[PDB]
Amino acid sequence: LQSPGIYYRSELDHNGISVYTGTIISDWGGRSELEIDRKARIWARVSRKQKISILVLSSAMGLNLREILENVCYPEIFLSFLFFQQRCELGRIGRRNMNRRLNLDIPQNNTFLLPRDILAAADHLIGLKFGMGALDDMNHLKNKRIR
Amino acid sequence: EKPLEELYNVRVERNVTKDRLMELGVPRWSMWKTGKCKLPWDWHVDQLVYIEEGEVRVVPEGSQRFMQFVAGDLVRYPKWFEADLYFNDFYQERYSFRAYGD
Amino acid sequence: VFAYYGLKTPPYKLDALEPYMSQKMLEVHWGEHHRSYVEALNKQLEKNDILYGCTMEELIKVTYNNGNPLPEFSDAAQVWNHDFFWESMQPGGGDMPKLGLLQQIEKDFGSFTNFREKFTEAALALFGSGWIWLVLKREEKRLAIVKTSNAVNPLVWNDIPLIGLDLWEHAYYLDYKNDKAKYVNVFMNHLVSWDAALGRMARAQAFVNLGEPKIPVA
Amino acid sequence: ESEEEARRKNWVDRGWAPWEEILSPEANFARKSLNEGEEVALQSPEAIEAFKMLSPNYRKKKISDMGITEDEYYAKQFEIKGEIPEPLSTMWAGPLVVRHVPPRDWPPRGWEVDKKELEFIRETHKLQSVRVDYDKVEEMVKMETDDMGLDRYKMFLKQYNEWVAANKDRLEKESYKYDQDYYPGRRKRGKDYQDGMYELPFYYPGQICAGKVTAIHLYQGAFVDIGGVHDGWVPIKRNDWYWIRHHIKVGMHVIVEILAKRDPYRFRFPIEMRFIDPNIDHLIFNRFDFAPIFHRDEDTNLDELRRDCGRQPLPRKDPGVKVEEEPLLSNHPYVDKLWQIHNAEQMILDDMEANPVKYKGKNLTELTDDEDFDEENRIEYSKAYYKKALLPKMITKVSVKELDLEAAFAERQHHNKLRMEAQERGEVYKIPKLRRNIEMDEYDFIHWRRSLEEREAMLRDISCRRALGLPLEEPGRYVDPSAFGKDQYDPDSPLYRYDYWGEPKNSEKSKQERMTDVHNKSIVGKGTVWYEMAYEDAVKERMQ
Amino acid sequence: KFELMPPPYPMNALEPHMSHTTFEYHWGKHHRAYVDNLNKQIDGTELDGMTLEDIILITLPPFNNAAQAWNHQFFWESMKPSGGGKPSGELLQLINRDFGSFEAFVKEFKAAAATQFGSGWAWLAYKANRLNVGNTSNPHPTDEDKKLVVVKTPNAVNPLVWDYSPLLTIDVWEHAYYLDFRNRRPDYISIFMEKLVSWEAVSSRLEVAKAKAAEREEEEERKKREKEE
Amino acid sequence: PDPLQERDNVQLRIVNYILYGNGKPIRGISDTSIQLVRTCLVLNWNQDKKSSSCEEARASFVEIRTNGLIRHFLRINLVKSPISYIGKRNDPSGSGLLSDNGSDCTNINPFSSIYSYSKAKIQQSINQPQGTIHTLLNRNKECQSLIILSAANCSRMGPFKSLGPLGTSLPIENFYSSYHLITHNQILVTNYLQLDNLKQTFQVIKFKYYLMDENGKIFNPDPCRNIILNPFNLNWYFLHHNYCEETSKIISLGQFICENVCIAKNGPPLKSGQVILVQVDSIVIRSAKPYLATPGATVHGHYGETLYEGDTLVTFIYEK
Amino acid sequence: MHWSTDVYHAPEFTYGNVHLLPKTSHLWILLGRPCRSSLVYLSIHKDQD
Ligand SMILES: [Fe+3]
Ligand SMILES: [Fe+3]
């Protein structure tokens, strides 16, 4: 079975630049997707609707809209753009993987979807647009677990 | 090769004379005594200590070497000094904490 | 046992600046204060051989001991600063900065008038005894003005002093008992050696380069 | 931004420089041909030229045509290209009036010299502070030698010859022991040590000297031999060499000035100099903040190394507490040993009562439990016996002579006498405090007095320093409040704390189940407490 | 708005050891400047309408000026143009108890005023301090806790700031003696210790300090009784 | 009870609660009487108003051994949340993983320094790569990085093919003139020295050596020429400014030299690296490797950016 | 990394390490060991140590 973690796939649109998306996989099987359009447009695909504001999600998480831009890299791109338990039920394995792909110093014990992880995810996602990234192969064994 | 007293700016006057002890009011200083113990102390101010009876060997923080003083020594500890003092017998000193100046 | 014993004579005669400073004041300031310090400095240096064999700048920086001045920091500092003060003044009036210095003053202060205003403001603001300095910062490569209490001099922060003034009262009381603003204005208008400052800047240019490198087109 | 500004930023910050690439013929042909295209007839002149140059016979023909020799053609490849700087001309400001003074650090640490002669040597230091009028120097020069007076310097030379003849082999042995390989800036040994060289104490910062460049390093700088076991060092960094290489070359004779003399053991380059004769100062822009040092195996404390090399203290996270406003310290370190020896004395004295036959025949003052008893063997960890909690039981064995049993015996005799007397009265006998407890209280009191005096002096020191502008904390110790990022501390500022969506899940971490369980086992009925008060308040109410 | 207070002795003919030209310049200029500056910087502020000590302890830019005037006036009052040479009364008892002798106290005052190294005031203070951090209270308190200490203060600093009580002051600033005489400070210090110090004001201030210490000790007992009741 | 007591974060409180609930009487056993009122003691560490604090205290048995006598005095100590002490004076007496272990210098007693000697006898670790710490100016402004240059990275190519402390400068009486400067720049002289004085050709005095004795008499074999005195031999010599040196360098500092370049028929340079050190008879080259790119490709890095093994350098978009 | 010539000194985008090459050139990797240096180590560990 596929291991929990962040996956960073990409998909090329019919017309325009290629769309980049990052999916977070939970132990229960939650899918907290994140997408980017031709603009910054850091939009989560959790809702069935057109999109959702990543800044609104970060503010609901607890970010005061200042430390968010202070901590994230390339804050210019973020500032320019103007259920809960199961999605955050990351396993120990999930925690480790999240830490690996997105360099994080979160202790293994804290197996929960922290907002810093989301922030970092967003940062990597925007970085993929400028070429600073690598997409993930979902057929790699390192991305799978054995029950 | 250089003594640790020079590195940590620890000024010690060994075998002070009676006239030197008469100056600075060494007799009127407060007294302190101990037996066998380890006293970690951080000097927020300079301290002039006249060790009368015992013997103290002080190690700097994180250092594997020690500085030894005898009963005939007048040792002034510098500011922001972090060190551990060990004793093995009756040790009586006269201490005076001085500010900037004398 | 005796080092730094010499009392630095001044680049000008003791009676050269008589219209604006009496010979007596200079005679007292030098004859007595300067002599007093050096005689204690060599006495302190005779005792400790380690501090004996050090350059004056290195001696001052070591005796400062990063915030805890040693008992030999004072004397040395005072001697050096008094010597600098003697050399920083010339038998001729200075009202204009020299060509190299001007460009630097315009670059940082933005005007000579603003520089003089800030210098006078800092000199009057300092309460008590001390010195004021115009220095070049090695880290930032810019000119700036520093006021130091008592004997402290910029060398302790790795800076090059270009000009310095004695705000200790002994310097001005005999002439002007309580008008520090006049004492300053006189030193700014008539008693200042900008040529010595430009020379010190040229000497410091070896240590700190004030310019832009040549970028090859490739 | 623009290419010009980007290139300037690269040169200034990242150290970019258009270094000459000495390519092979195939590499040059690849660089020239790939610009046109793939499988297309080459039409550029340089591409066809390189294609023809791919053959050795064509290169030989071109060499013969140009008329240069093969050795000249080999060096033509290693030719600096681009703009070439104009040759620099030395300019002297005026006459150079010099002196021969003995160095200020002549006496070596651990070497004894005559004091009376040392004073005559050091007398030149006060004489060096006499001005000379440089403009009228030529008018006063005397061309008659053999009348110059250098007696102090000659006596210094004699004393220095003594020291070098004494310590030459010792210095060579120490250099062979500490240093494995020779490097520019190290002592010349073995075959390189020709007799007549000048030792390191012979030099001093401020002495003008002259030497020849022997080595040129890109990162470290240029090394000049000034006739000594240790060469000189002129700090020239990476990016300035692109333009300094046209003025500083190996084998050139230059005039240098000694700026700082250091220790070879703690510094890679003992002497640092500046180039007076070339005067390349307009060129240098990248400087060294601190002098290079040696990180050796003997060094185990970084703070001692920082103090020895003069660098700033190790950075530490700044505590938000104020040392001026804090509770004083009254606890004494000897209190623990005094309490343990008090307990040991009480136990041995009570157990001598239980066995009167054992106490009889042996004096209380002189007693020996074990001959080979040691304090080191006493320290141990034992968690076998656990009534409610299991933890290691630290064992301490008090020494026999450490306990003074006569005072304890007299105290217990008096105490049991008063106990039986009060029982005859009909009231339980109570004693407030024993002697050793009062002694421990006196220790705590003198420690509190010491702490109070320290804080009282600290208040005045704060004022004095603040008044005079002196800093209160050691500069460089507490530097970064938050500067180092990605530090997990669960403070909710980098959003490292659990999401504030309810925080209902606590089984993973910080589970308070065990505490509630043991509280329910101790007290099943969690009724509203009728009387809730502090321990000290209850004890005082019992007293008052 | 505080006003400059004249000295007790006639400034013109007070002491042949201090020139009236000197006296005038120093006193007038300094006091006036401090007060006006102080009056200028406290006008239209909460600090106005309070004593100097209140201001001293509260202050900041209105600190240096206030302290200097307060110090200067204390300095003037500390001396009269007669009676110097030896103290008496409780002063001698406290001096021989702590210092050991009057000559020892004089030597300590001289060796503290001489080594100021710049702008400073020397002080003899009666130490009655109460800290507000942690275990300030002293168990088994007794005599000899309050002592006479000779302290040296930097520019604009007074012992009032560390809860100490000011008894006697020498103004070791250049203005005091540089103008008057050739600038050899030991002379001025020696003459102060000889021919101008007034011990009667010191005795009165020691009485006031012992009264304030007694009132603080009785306030402690009142608080303890309120705790018991 | 003690006259002087200190302050600690750990606190104690006595809680007395009713056994049974009000209004409901439980059955009373005839053998054991019911307990109407009960009392208990709790240990709770002090909690700040800003941040709540949870008590972390463990109980460990402590026994003093006196002739086979054990003291059942189990000391209870509370571990404060602060990992490190604010000051050494307020620091704990024991801060170590194992109290019995004496490998630590602080654990070793000063009177008995056998443990300190045993710790010092231990050799240093091999974590250091035995190289030179080469900092990066590119990352200097941001979080810095380090490059370690060792014998694996730098190699010596091999053999390709008077001087003394003359004196010390003296103070100048005419300090206002530019005499304190021992030399003038070609480039910088204009800024500080008006060339009116130097307008005449060679107006500035040429290098002269003016020796002064202890008495103060200017001495030189030639009155106003460039004869130099040796300090040791105390004999005059010439510095030979020309030096009679005619040497040509076939390799300049900082030049990247590929393989098979063949600087001479005898020995071809190698290592495809930059020349970091140039000596009289040998050259040191820091090893490197060339990567041939093409127009249109992308370079994934800045100039002074460190690349680890496996990192991507250039992306080529070859047609299929 | 090192490039002498024929490489644009400005990134292709506002943010990122991507650089474009106008003409053919070489990219030189100067061999060395990259370490991770904290703020504490930088005080004692400096250039040419
Ligand atoms: Fe002065
Ligand atoms: Fe005054």
From Swiss-Prot, chain A:
It comes from the Eukaryota. Coiled coil: none annotated. It is found in: Plastid, Chloroplast. Disulfide bonds: none annotated. Belongs to the RNA polymerase beta chain family. In plastids the minimal PEP RNA polymerase catalytic core is composed of four subunits: alpha, beta, beta', and beta''. When a (nuclear-encoded) sigma factor is associated with the core the holoenzyme is formed, which can initiate transcription. DNA-dependent RNA polymerase catalyzes the transcription of DNA into RNA using the four ribonucleoside triphosphates as substrates. This is DNA-directed RNA polymerase subunit beta. The chain holds residues 127 to 315 of 1070 of the full protein.
Curated annotation (Swiss-Prot), chain F:
It is found in: Plastid, Chloroplast. It comes from the Eukaryota. Belongs to the RNA polymerase beta' chain family. RpoC2 subfamily. DNA-dependent RNA polymerase catalyzes the transcription of DNA into RNA using the four ribonucleoside triphosphates as substrates. In plastids the minimal PEP RNA polymerase catalytic core is composed of four subunits: alpha, beta, beta', and beta''. When a (nuclear-encoded) sigma factor is associated with the core the holoenzyme is formed, which can initiate transcription. This is DNA-directed RNA polymerase subunit beta''.
